[PDB]
Structure formats: structure tokens, C-alpha cells
Structure 1
Amino acid sequence: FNLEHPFFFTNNDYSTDTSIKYQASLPFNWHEVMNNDEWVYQYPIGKFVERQGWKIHISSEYNSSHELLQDVAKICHEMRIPFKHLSTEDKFIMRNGKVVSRGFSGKFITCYPNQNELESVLQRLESALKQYNGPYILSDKRWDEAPIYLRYGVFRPSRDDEKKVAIDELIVGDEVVKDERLPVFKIPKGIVPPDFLNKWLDKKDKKQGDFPFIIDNAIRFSNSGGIYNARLKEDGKKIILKEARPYTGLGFDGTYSSEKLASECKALKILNEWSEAPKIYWHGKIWEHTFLGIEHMKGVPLNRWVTNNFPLYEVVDKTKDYLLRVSKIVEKLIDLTNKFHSENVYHQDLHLGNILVKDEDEISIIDWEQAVFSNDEKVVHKVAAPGFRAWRETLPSEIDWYGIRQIAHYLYMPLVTTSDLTYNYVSQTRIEGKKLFESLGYTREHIDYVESLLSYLDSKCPQIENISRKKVLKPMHEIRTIESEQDIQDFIIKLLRGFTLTYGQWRKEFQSRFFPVAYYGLNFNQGIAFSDLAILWSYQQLAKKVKNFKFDDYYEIRTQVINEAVNNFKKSSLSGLFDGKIGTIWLIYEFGEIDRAVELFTTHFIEIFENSQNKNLYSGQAGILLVGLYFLSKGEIDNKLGEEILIRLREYTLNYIENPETFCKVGASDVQSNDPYENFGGLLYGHAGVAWLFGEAYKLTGESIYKNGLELAVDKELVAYKRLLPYLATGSAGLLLLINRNKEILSSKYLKYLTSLERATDVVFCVLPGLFNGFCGLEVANNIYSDIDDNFSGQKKLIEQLYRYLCVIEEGFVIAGDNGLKITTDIASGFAGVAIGLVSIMDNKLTILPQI
């Protein structure tokens, strides 16, 4: 949004609140105290407010919000009910929008009266307002005609003489009930209503010309409607409808969803004579909401069409015949786009999910809620997909043409998702896709046809000035081949140079951390997953590979990270290897101050072993055992400290041999955001990290106890031999890494599968650029332990594949972060996420984890 800061991520420190605030006049014997940046509480002084009473939630629209607030304040000041309301316009938009949860909607004014002075204040409020219709909150029933809603909610925290405080537990009797925020008005158990309110709870009204809809499913309850099917009583075709509750759903401008669906109705009413043309089967307003049902055609969205029809592997694409399909569907897109540009109707939102394709490659356009019926203004693109946002308030027809250009460049090369970050990013895809379509062996006529199409779509795009504060980021146009080692050093000095640039950009805007992090790990500041010193460590190792440093800021940062990386042990409580307590000690070990690192390792060793509730390589005792094993191989500690480590490691594997499941839990096979019960493949979050532990343990010591558990761990990882997850951390490339590490140890039956998963991991495309869940983790493991000098071939593979993810800044390059947009540098996806691969591919060390 507008308050969302560019370049890097931001959790919450730019609540700027540059808008008109909400406040009311304060009389004597009253107060206005600031609550948590959203409410202002006003209470009379010396008046005993009680707990556990009947609240009233008053809701209103955007236009009459100030007038209704002034009316409720002026009717509530002369009498003795406490009163609170929202702070500013931006928080009012946030509480009445499309992304906010449906349980908290319309929370504008919550007064807190008493039991005795209740009927009087409700009748006074009803007669006082008597107008200003607004949203219906999904908590209560609408008392009278004014938007007055009585919820038996939560009051002030419990007094010192009272007991059982229990916030949001409502304390009915001795027992307390969880105040669930269900959309249906449900009275909690017990609690006798008052006599004047008992006649309000039973005002049931009769039936009428009831809707002929049979609602079967519900997928997408955002705030007001849903992407959900239904059944029609008369027409046998499937129907999907939208729900428009009045006065809810908003952008930064005062546009409700009712007129958005009205615009969709007035668009698809004249879009009825076309081949796809989802016509309005029924339009009307029932009770107070507005419904709109449209026909659904059979097909798949373009995400599934791209991920099912693209030459990822050499065996999935047989007899080619893919660029002909691309040319056909882009030609259909161009013809149908020029079709509706005559009657002055446009889309203004071109998304992958808005383009539906079916058998014989027939396109279909849906989701016309943001249509426009006039092309003579220069409005800015308000709502857009992550990768399909226009720039500099350009013309709506060419906003649609920009969306068509971006979706065609996605079809040529699927990397649209960072085009909101770097302007004209599609030149990267246009340059890069030709060099691999000439490598797969596609026909020159088809390649020249699709390149001529992409050049034709560039003629209708508004090439304009770049004023969006992201003038730092530009695309490359000097993507050349790699034929010498001098190419490698003058590339890698550019990659070195590009880091202090974004470091200065980050420090000139934030002061909390030192390096930017991805959202998933913005709060994390430890380990070798999301921290502030692992990236600088990779920077130091990769700068050691170049004959000159040319670093402006490298000494005070080095002397500062040691000072700021020692107080986290008394603050943080997350252990393990990645984002753990011992990962920072491991980082300090390859940093300098070896005596300080050994002292920290000898100090914090026993307290971090029993504090792990899991046994994974990410957060578990395996990482502490790995770092202790590495320290035993290095010889930095004594035998008195090193004796019990092997004994505690044997207890980790004797139960593992007898019980191989233990903490394996359910058989999940997805990752997504990598929190909820991961795919447990490979390293890190995977189940195969114990194989890496057993390999590094049998590298140092030797017996038959560790080898059997090693082979059992390889067989336990081997049950997934079947997919679309070849990645390094959570994927199948970790198994290739383990087998390449222990080729002399494992038998020829186990080495027989080495030639099998190589064709599985030889994909020509991955979405993310990182090494955990990106492309670089595959290529760093493809030649990790080849025992041969093909390092230059490995660089000439990896960098030429990595040219598609680069954005140029000064004379340097930098990596787009997770999910494409919102650039960062970490081990997951960043400068370090290629820097570790670069320093590992030409040294065969893989500095993430040692080789004993």
C-alpha cells in the first residue's frame, strides 16, 4: 500500500498516519486517554463503571462518520456513559475493508453504559441518531433503524478486590466461556437478558419470495463475499455468486464493493455476445445485501496451465509443441483485448487467476469487478496483483495493455513477480528466455514469432519517466556469455560492490537491524538462516576470493557485530542450528576472537541441549551435536567437555534405530510459507539431517552403530522416491548432497539411485533465486563432490542461469528476495543466498556444513 515502505520489508514501524484524525470535544469532569494507537477512551471521573455488562457497537459509513461521531459524543457527554471511538481515517479504512477479518468489522463507537441506565440510553441513542445507515456488524442484531447493535462484550479489567480477571472470557458464573467472535449473533450460556430486551430477541418476521439458491461450498470469505459455488433451481448450469454487504470493503478512496459489483454488472451486461462472456443470470438486492450470480466455465487458471505445460524437464516435453500454443493463446489474448476496446470497457486488473484456459487452448477472462467505462482520464492503478501494477498514473487502456505485456512475458518466461520492484523487468525475461529456447532446441520460426509478438506488445506500452523512489533499481541489458575466469572475477567484484549500496540504503532508513531480512525471518537475528552476521560472514569469505577488497565499510561493522551478537543469549530463547543459539557461536568461530568463541562455546553448551523440544536439524539437538562434533574435529575444547557429547549422541541414535518415526508425525509434502508441518524432505526442516550427522560422525570416529542408522535414515528419506519438489533444503537435492558427501561409504545399491535423481534435479527453471528454496541450491549440489576440475563449467552454468534474477544498481548486482518482490539479503533468498553458492561451487567445501 501507500504506507508500505518500498525496497525492503517492514513489520510495523511506519504507521505514519498522514490523514484526518477522529476526535471529539472534551468537557470538564471527563478525560481522553490514548489506547493502543487505534482507540481514544473517554470516561467520566469518579463514576463507577462496572464489568461484564451490555455494550453497544455503533457503526457508520465514511461520508457521515464525522457527523455521527459528533452526534454520539454530544448526546453522550451530558450523561454518564463512558465512550470510545476510532483514532483516524486510515484505521477506519482498515476496520472497514476487504482484507480485514469478518469478525472485526464496523467497530467505530463502543459505549459502555450501566444496567439501570440502559433502556433510557438506548432509546435516547435511537431517537438522537435516527438516520445515518451504515454497515451491519456480524456480532449482533440491528436494534431499531439506526445502526445500533448490542453485544454482551468485555469491559475494563477486573478490580483488585474482585478476582478471576480472565480477559475475553466473560466470566458467566464460576465458569468462564471463550468469547468466540463468530459471525452469527450467539448469546452465551447462562446470562438472563433484561425484561425490556427479552421482547427484542424474538422479533421474527415471516417469509417472502425466497431466493432460488442452494449454497454448497465456501472458499474465500474475506470480509463481505466469497469465491463460492451454488446450485440454481431452474438452470442446470453451475452458478457462482458474489455477496455485497453494504458499506464494507474499501480502498484508500471511498469506494465500496457495492458499486464495484455494480460496475461488474454493467460491464458483463454488455459483455454477453462474446464466446466466453459470463452473463448475469440474476441481479437484485434481497433484504439489505446485494447478490450477483455469474456463470462458471470449466477450465483451469493460468498458474496450473503454466506449471503443467512448460518444459521444466527434458522428458516432460515431447515433440516440443509449446511455443505454438503460447503464440496461439497470446494471439487470442490480443484479438480479444482489442475486441472490448471498442465499446469503452476495460479490465484494469490482469492476473494469472483472471485468465481461464480450457481444452484446445481457449482463453476466458473473468473477475471484471474493477472495470471502467471511460477512457479520457489518467487515474492511477489502485488495486493490482503482485507483479501487475502500472506506474505514474497512466491511461486505463494502456494499463490493460501493460497487464497484457506482463502476462505475455510471464508466458515467455515465468518470472513476473518482481516487476513491481524494478521497472521494465520484462527485458530480463526477453533476453534470458531466448538463450534457453535456443538451448532446448525449439524451432527458429516459433522463437522469432514469439519474439516478434513480444516486440509488438512493447509498442503499446507507455514508456514513461520513472518517478517512484525506485530509480535505484534498473534492469540489465549486458547479459553476455561466460568464456573466461576474468568474467568470473569482474562479475563477482560487481556482486561484492552491490552489497554496501543496499547496506547504506537500509541503514539510512532503519536503525533496528544491520541487514534487511525476509518477512518470514525479519524478527530473527541469529543463526545462519535469518541474522545479521551470517551475511557479513559470507561477504568476508567471498571477498577473500578476490585479489582486492575495495570495501568502504568493513572494519567498524566487523567490530560492531561481535558487540551486538552477545546480548541475544540473555534475550532470545530459540535454539537449534538455523536461527539457534549455537549458530552464532559457529559464526564467531570462523570470524576471529577464537578464544572468545571457545569461551562462549564452553559457557553455553549444556543449557541449549535440554532446551530443545524438537529433534530436527532446523531447531533441535542435532545442530548442537553437529557444532560440537565440528569443534571436536577442530580440537578447540578438552576431553572432559568432549566425552559426554558422544554419549548423548548415542542416546539420540539407539532409539532412532529401534523407533525410526518418533517425531516424523504426519506425512505432509508441501512447504508454502514453511511454518505449518513442513514436507520434511532433505536438510534443514527435513528428516535427512540425521544422515548428515551420522556421516560427519563416521568421518571422525568409526563403528557399526552409526552406519546402520545412517542407512536407515537414507531409506527413510528414500520413501519419497516418485516430484515437483527437487529443491535443496526441503526437496530431493539434499539426498543427492548426502550421497555425494558419502559416496565411498554407501554401497553400490544406494549409489545406483545417484544416476536416477540427477535427471529429476536437472530442471531448467526454478521460481525463487535462493539456495534454501530457490534455484542456486540445486546447482551448488550438482557439482559439489565431483572430485574433478569442472569448476569453471559450474560457474558458467550457475551464473548464466542466475542472470534472470539480477537487478543492476550502480555498477553492481543484487538479488531479488523472497516471492520475487521486496528485495532482501539473507541465506534464504538474497546476496548471501547466492554468495554461499558462489564460494562453495569453486572450493567444493559447502561452508554451510563442514566435512569434519
Structure 2
Amino acid sequence: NMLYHRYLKPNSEYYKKIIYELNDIPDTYAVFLDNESVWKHYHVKGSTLPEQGWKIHVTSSLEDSKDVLDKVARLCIDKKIEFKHLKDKDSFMKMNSKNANRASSGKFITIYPTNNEVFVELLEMISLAIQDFKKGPYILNDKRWKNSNVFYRYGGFKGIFNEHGEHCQRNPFYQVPDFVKDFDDYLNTINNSRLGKYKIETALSFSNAGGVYLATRKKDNLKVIIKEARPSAGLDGAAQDALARQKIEYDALKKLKDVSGVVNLIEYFQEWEHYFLVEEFIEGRDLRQWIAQEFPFFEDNNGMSNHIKDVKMILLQLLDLIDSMHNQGVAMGDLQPANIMVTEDLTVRIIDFETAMPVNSDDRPAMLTTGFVSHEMKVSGARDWFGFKRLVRYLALPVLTSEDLEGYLQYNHLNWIKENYGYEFYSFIVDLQEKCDKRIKDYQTFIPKEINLNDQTSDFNLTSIINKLIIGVESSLTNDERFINGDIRQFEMNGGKFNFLTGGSGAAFTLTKNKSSIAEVDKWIQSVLLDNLPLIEEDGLFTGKTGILALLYDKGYKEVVLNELKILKDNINQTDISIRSGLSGIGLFVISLYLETENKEYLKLAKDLERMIKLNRAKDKQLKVKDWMAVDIGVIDGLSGVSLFYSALYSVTQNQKYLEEAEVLIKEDLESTKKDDVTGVLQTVDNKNRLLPYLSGGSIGVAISIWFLNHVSGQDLYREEMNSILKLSKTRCTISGGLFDGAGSFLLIPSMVKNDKNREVILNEVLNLLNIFLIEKNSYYVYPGQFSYRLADDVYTGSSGIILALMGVIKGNPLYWLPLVNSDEFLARTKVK
């Protein structure tokens, strides 16, 4: 999810992507680099090393980090010792940023002396060469010498990979082996309170920069936040350490001690070698959390006026607070929902000022929160106001957007606010907006956009939406190998450029269903794709070859598909049973091919795949998840998905066993659901205890599997659960718009509803949701990808997924997003009898 930032290349509506070598190496060394690892390996001579011994770590500050590798590595070659170091300055940053993992932070060079003797031998003569230098980050994993950047401790050298996941331990603190404890006592002997007035209960968070600690002042009982900043550790894009940031938080907290909204400074001192900022411990939630917990996501016809109250209250306080801050010449330089807190009585507080900057300064900040920023703002104070301006609309409609799409989605958003709230609240928002507009004009020449709401209208005609999204896709063909722009996964994942989920086949399949762009599709299939087939190892329905084979077969490439089918069993991944990428998805494809060709060899293969699924299930009951957005419940990556396979297999088999299995797999997924007490809506429960509606990981997925179970068998099982899931149609707003993870999921609800009067309401509800996202551009429609930061045309997040869902509604086909052979006939062919 944080990966998205890497794909916000300037001046594009699409997701597009934006060394420590030594001097004169002796031939006695083998050098291994890394397009994978952070480590640049140095193997010495020919002989390998002990599995575990005492190792030396060398840390280094930034100012001159090159002068510490130019020296230490050469004594690692004078004595001919084995070592490894970070690849590049870039890799240095990842290990030594605020963000970095403390466990192995600081570690720049790792030296491997064999054991005991050469270790102490080395550790001394290193410190003679690197003694006249700036100190680097202390490694909280190791022990230190004097004022030395030389560290040490015991651990494995070349970590084996075992059953429980060895790596032979590196922990946030210091440790001792129960084995070689004796030699530990040796070096012990060669090696040469202000916060005592606080009782530290617990720590909220730690980081590479330091901890944040809940403490009660010794005899006073006042709860305080204690913010640690250890020097030179936790670097910024700006190359500023934890300290420099802390002594900017300090300056600001005083300078606005008079503002009662701002957190109040208690004290600020030094200790061991660290620096501590003590502040007043505030109770409530950030606006992100407040929105998550308090926003009326479910549409009840008992009004939404309560929320209008609280928003108006919160925003006005915030308007005051920002004015106060700007009086004192300080801009809180990251104005966005994370940094605004709000107590149980809804008192607006600002808590972190590490990003504070003098208003009137035109310096690029270290950190920009996409969604609450614009490249138009060139001055610190104006950045605050723009933040607030966007935050204003956000509390009304909590749906992120980037500057690249804001030109479109402001229409959709503002129109939504009116249609759903009073005109009074619409006009409140739009006034407070323009109230911000020229608080900006104070700091900089800013000539704002003139918005007329009647220039964009929301669309509820399925044929119109499908037609216009198609015309969009046709107008948006890349002339390259991807065919369409899509999610970042086109670049991040194997086969992502070609597969059904994020690649060209998704669009080509969709365009084919709408009889559009035949020549463009034929060109892409012939010039690209067929040549890329041999390079896609994965067989997955969405992620790999099988979804592509569906496209290919429909388009007339029997010979290719039939040869692929011959190869399909022989080498088949068997650890994975999901619809996304495992045996269920493949099996579903294989059954569809059976139905189309009536070749009984495909039925046999389908039964072989089932046996593999049975085996996998027996082996262990833990599902394996490869995508970072994958969740082991529901239709895409869990057991509901596998039930799709059993149901389909049942249809071509008439064998009750498969039907009973289909049922059991749904039952199992239903155990991880939770019915809400107020609103009677059923959702799935994540492992992170998140509640999910979406097609990917959510209850809409489970409903689809119930529907298909019922479709093949002529039953009406799980009606109670079903009815509780269709109630999700009352959802207003979602984080994102896409079929898998966003609004598009909800389009699948109406396609499951038999009677029309009930359907038409549900359809209208879900089209209200779609219309937050559906972008009018030129004469046609396009669609925002994940987080509405850029447009996407793929199935996973973009317009192709929407089109398929919408055609699903028309056809009463909740399975229409699956890339199956034929598929216009699939329901008819799998129906009961």
C-alpha cells in the first residue's frame, strides 16, 4: 500500500515508476552483489567459515560514510577476513531511516572473524583507523567499545533455512547465549536520573529514531508522553536525524505554548546520550480513527444529521487552531487526518510537529501526504491551508484522492455531499473551502479553479456506463506491451503485464465481450503475449496462464490452448488452492474448457486437480497468501473460492460428494463472519480483526459462493446469511473504487437478487457508490485505481473490472468477472439438472 508512492511519476494520470564499491580488489575475493538483497557479499579465499561465532559490526554516520568503507574493508583484506556491507547509499537509508527496523538498524559492515582469538585481535586494530570520525547510530543489538562505532556479539554466519525458519538472535535489546557464556565474561573485562522522576508504565511505539513512552511523573500523578530521539539515528529524505527533528518539535511547542489546542510541553532534557521531550498525554483518537469508528458508513433512514453536527464542531475548532499557529509564525507542516487528534468530548488537538516550519518559507518539506497536498502550493503556510481545505471535504466524504485526479473527483465528491447531506451543509463546506482558498492568497499568488457542479452528472444507466467506460478503454490503450495502464502490480508482480488481474488480457477479454477494438486486440495478442507466454511460470487463473488461455481460446487459438493443456498437469504448483492463483481457479478454468469442448480428457484433469486439492487440505489447513492485499477468507484467496470449484465439479459430475464438500467449505468460511447488532450486516473477520465486505476477502465473496452452490444444486441454502450480506448495499462510500478491494465489489450484490422491485433499490444504492468514483473525461468515462491516486483500466482496480461487474448485473451473473472459457454460456451449462 505504501508502494503506491513509488508510482506517482509527475504529469501522468497513470501509475508509472518515477554505490559502495571498493578501490582495487585482490583476485583472492569473490564479489556478490544484489538486485535482491541489501547485502554485498565478500567471500574470502576458497574456504568457508564456521556456522556461528563472534562477529564485528561497524556502524557509520552519513556526513562521510564513504571514508569508513574505504578504510575498514582494506584491513578486512590486509588480514584477509570475511565481511559484507550494504549495497548503496540508498540501501543505507532504508536500514537507517526513521522507518527502519531497529533489530538490524545501524549495521553497515558485518565482519566474520572465525572464532574467539582473531575476533579480539581484529576488534582492537579496527578502532585505530576509525577514531577521528563523527559517531553513527548506536546499534541496540550489540555491545559497544569506547566512543567506538565498533560493535560486536555472537550469532550465526551463514544461516540455514529450516522447518521453523532458522537464520542460524537479533532482537531490539542485548542478549547472551546459554552456550558460550564464558567468553562473554572475558570481553566484559577487556571492555572499558532526570527520567528517574517518572514511572514508565509502557511504550506506545518505538522506531529507529527512538521510543514514545507513557509515564506518570513521580509523585504528581500526571501522565506524560516521553519522546526519545537518539542522535544521528533515524534519517529523513532531507537527511535530518531524529535530534534535528526533535529540536524542531521543541521550538514549535514552546512558540505555541499559548495555544491551548496544541499539546503542551512539560520539559526537555538529555540523559545517557539520548534526548527526551516530555509532553501532556492526550486521550482520544486521530481523525483517521475517528472517521473509521464514528462515520455513518451504513445508510439508515434515521438521518445523517448527527454527523453534520460533529464535523462542523471539529472543523471550526481546527480553523481557529490553524489561525493561532499562523499567528506565531509556525506552520504545522503536515496538515492531514493522522496529525489531528480529537478527544471523547471532541476537542481538536495537534500532537506531532516534527514537520513544523516557519510560515513564509518556500522550502520543499521532507514529507508530503499525498491526498492533502498539491504541487501548486509553494509556501509553508499555504501548505497548511490546502491540507485543511482538503480535510474539510474529507470529513464529509472520507475518500482519498491525489492532485492528479482531484481536478475530476472534486465534482463527484461535492455533488455527493449535496445529494446526501443538506444544501446547507454542502454550502457550509464550499464556503469553508473558499475560506481556505484565499487564506492561501495571503501567502502566495494562487488563482483557484472555478467549479460548476452541473458540468458533471452522476449516471445510473448501466448501458450508458458500460458504453462510456469501453470508449474510455479504447481511448486509453498504451501502445506498449501492457496493452492498458493498471495497478502498480503490473510492474511489481510476475506476469502482471499480461495476466487477467492487472495485465493486458483483462482489458482484451473485456473489450472482446463488448465486441470493441477487435484489431487492437488481435495486434496485441499476436505481436505481444504469445511471445510472453513462455516466460510466465505461474498457471493461476488471475495471476498466470489459465486466465490468458480463456481469452486465447475465445479468440480462436485452439492449437495454443490445447498444447498448454497437455503441459498443465505435469508441472503444477500444489501448495496453493486459491481462486486467485491456485488449484481451484485452474480447476474452474479446466471445467469451463470441458464444458466448451466436451473433451473428456479435461474432466479427467479436473478430477486430478480435485485430488490435489483434497491432498493439500489434508496436509495442513493453513492457507498461503502471497499478495500483500490477500486475506485467507472468502472467494479470492480462501475456502469460499475452493467451494466454487467443488460446485462446478458437481455440475459436470452429478456426484454428491463434491456438493457436500462445496457446502462444508462455505460453512468453514462462515465461521469467520460477524453479524453487526445495529445494522444486520454480515461481514468477514480478518486475522487482524478487520471487518471486510469486499469481493476480495469479504462477505460479498462468500455470498457469490453460496449463490453458485445454490445455482448448481437448485437449493436455497444459507438464505439467512445471504440476506444479511445483501444488506451491505446500504454502504455509502468506500476507501477505494475497485472491483476487488473497493466500491466495484458492491456492484456484485444486485446480480444476486431475484425479484426486481428489491433489485432496483439495491442497484440504485450501489450505483450511488459507483458514482463517487466514475470519472467523466472528454466524452467518455475512465476509472480511478487504488486510492484514486491514478487511473487504471485493469480488472483488479480499474475500468475493466467495473465493466465486467456491470455486465454481470445485466446478465444476473455474479461470476462474470472470472476469466472462464465461453462464460456467456457458463451459468446455463452449470445450472441444476
- TM-score with structure 2 setting the length: 0.80
Q: Cα distance 1:276–1:77, how it changes in 2: closer, same or farther (>3 A)?
A: same
Distance 1:708 1:449 in 2: 57
**2:475 is equivalent to residue 535 of structure 1:** no
What secondary structure is seen at the aligned counterpart in 2 of 1:284? strand
* Preserved contact between residue 225 and residue 279 of structure 2 (Cα < 8 Å): yes
Distance of 1:390 and 1:837 partners within structure 2: 33
Is the CA contact 1:517–1:530 (under 8 Å) kept in the aligned structure 2? no
Q: 2 CA distance for matches of 1:635 and 1:281?
A: 77
The one-character-per-residue Cα deviations of 1:567-599 (angstroms, maximum 9, x if unpaired) are: 24xx62x55544355434333322321243234
Equivalent residues of 2:56, 2:119 under 8 A apart: no
The residue aligned with 1:835 is 803
Cα distance in 2 between the residues matched to 1:629 and 1:169: 42
Are the counterparts in 2 of residues 284 and 291 from structure 1 also a CA contact under 8 Å?
yes
Counterpart CA distance in 2 for 1:804 and 1:753 is 28
Q: Aligned runs of 1:617-766 on 2, under 5 Å? A: 617-638=579-600, 642=603, 645=606, 673-675=628-630, 678=632, 680-681=633-634, 683-693=635-645, 695-697=647-649, 699-700=651-652, 702=654, 716=668, 718-719=670-671, 720=673, 722=675, 723=683, 724-738=691-705, 742=710, 750-751=718-719, 755-766=723-734
- The residue identity in structure 2 corresponding to 1:847 is Y
| Structure 2: 5+ residue stretches without partners | 676-682, 684-690, 819-825
Equivalent-residue separation in structure 2 for 1:319 and 1:821 (angstroms):
28
Once the two structures are TM-superposed, the CA of residue 523 in structure 1 deviates from its matched residue by: 1.7
Instruction: Say if 2:594 and 2:602, in contact at 8 Å, map to a contact too.
Output: no
Q: 2:247 aligns with which of 245, 253, 262?
A: 262
Offset of residue 743 of structure 1: 6.6
Q: 2:741 aligns with which of 759, 773, 777?
A: 773
Residue 240 of structure 1: SS of its match in structure 2? strand
AA at the equivalent of 1:522: E
Output the amino acid matched with 1:320. S
Gaps of 5+ in 1: 156-166, 171-175, 467-473
Aligned length: 785
* Structure 2 match to 1:136: 138
The aligned residue for residue 480 of structure 1 is 457
One-letter amino acid of the structure 2 residue matched with residue 377 of structure 1: S
2:680 aligned partner:
none
Rate the CA distance shift 1:99–1:475 in 2: closer, same or farther, 3 A.
farther
In structure 2, the CA distance between the partners of 1:189 and 1:810, relative to structure 1 (3 Å rule), is: farther
Is the contact made by 2:208 and 2:234 (CA closer than 8 Å) also made in structure 1? yes
- SS of 1:239's equivalent in the other structure is strand
Q: What's the CA shift for 1:401?
A: 0.9
Q: Which residue of 2 aligns with 1:159?
A: none
1:138-168 deviations in Å (ceiling 9; x for gaps): 332221223222345677xxxxxxxxxxx13
**Kindly tell me: are residues 690 and 31 of structure 1, through their superposed partners in 2, closer, same or farther at Cα, counting changes over 3 Å?**
closer
Give the Cα–Cα distance (whole angstroms) in 2 for the partners of residues 36 and 747 of structure 1. Answer: 56
Task: Identify the residue that residue 183 of structure 1 maps to in structure 2.
Answer: 172
The residue correspondences of 1:444-523 to structure 2 (distance < 5 A) are 444-461=423-440, 478-482=455-459, 487-488=464-465, 491-500=468-477, 503-504=478-479, 507=480, 516-519=486-489, 522-523=492-493
Answering whether residue 188 of structure 2 is matched by residue 201 of structure 1, we say: yes
Distance 1:302 1:81, change over 3 A: same
Q: Distance in 1 between matches of 2:145 and 2:125?
A: 13
2:773 corresponds to: 805
Aligned-pair Cα RMSD in Å: 4.8
CA distance in 1, matches of 2:144, 2:49: 25
8 Å contact kept, 2:473–2:793: no
Aligned-residue offset at 1:413: 1.3
Contact 1:616 1:689 in 2 (8 A): yes
| Deviation string, structure 1 residues 37-67 (Cα, Å, up to 9, x no partner) | 76778899x8999767654333232224355
By how many angstroms is 1:515 displaced?
5.8
Query: How many Å separate the matches in 1 of 2:558 and 2:4?
Result: 47
Aligned to 1:601: 565
The code of the aligned residue for 1:622 comes to S
Q: How far apart, in 1, do the equivalents of 2:211 and 2:371 lie?
A: 23
Give the CA deviation at 1:70.
5.4
Q: Indicate conservation of the 8 Å contact 2:333/2:365, yes or no.
A: yes
2:230 maps to 1:245 = yes
Cα distance 1:519–1:444, how it changes in 2: closer, same or farther (>3 A)?
same
Q: Which residue matches 1:168?
A: 159
Q: For residue 379 of structure 1, what is the aligned residue in structure 2? A: 363
SS in structure 1 of the partner of residue 318 of structure 2: helix
Q: Offset of 1:306 from its aligned partner?
A: 1.4
Deviation at 1:260, TM superposition (A): 0.7
1:465–1:580 distance in 2 versus 1, CA, 3 Å: farther
Distance apart, 1:247 and its partner CA: 0.8
Correspondence 1:60-99 to 2 at 5 A: 60-68=60-68, 88-99=88-99
Aligned-residue offset at 1:400? 0.9
> Under a length normalisation based on structure 1, what TM-score does the superposition of the two structures give?
0.78
| Letter of the structure 1 residue corresponding to residue 429 of structure 2 | V
Q: Per the alignment, do residues 67 and 840 of structure 1 end up closer, same or farther by CA in structure 2, a change over 3 Å counting?
A: same
Is 1:518–1:817's contact at 8 Å kept on the other side of the alignment? no
Distance 1:460 1:706 in 2: 67
Q: State the match for 2:687 in structure 1.
A: none
Provide the secondary structure at the position in 1 that maps to 2:492.
Answer: coil
Query: Contact 1:494–1:813 (CA<8 Å) still a contact in 2?
Result: yes
Alignment partner of 1:847 out of 792, 816, 828: 816
Query: Relative to structure 1, is the Cα distance of residues 803 and 478 closer, same or farther in structure 2, using a 3 angstrom cutoff?
Result: farther
Alignment-derived partner of residue 428 in structure 1? 409
Structure 1 counterpart of 2:423, which letter? R
**What is the deviation of 1:726?**
2.5
Q: Report SS of the residue matched to 1:136.
A: coil
Secondary structure of the residue aligned to 2:388 is helix
- Whole-Å Cα distance in 1 between the matches of residues 315 and 383 of structure 2? 17
Alignment of 1:225-244 (within 5 A): 225-244=210-229
Could you tell me which residue of structure 2 aligns to residue 149 of structure 1?
151
Q: How far, CA to CA, are the matches of 2:733 and 2:595 in structure 1?
A: 38
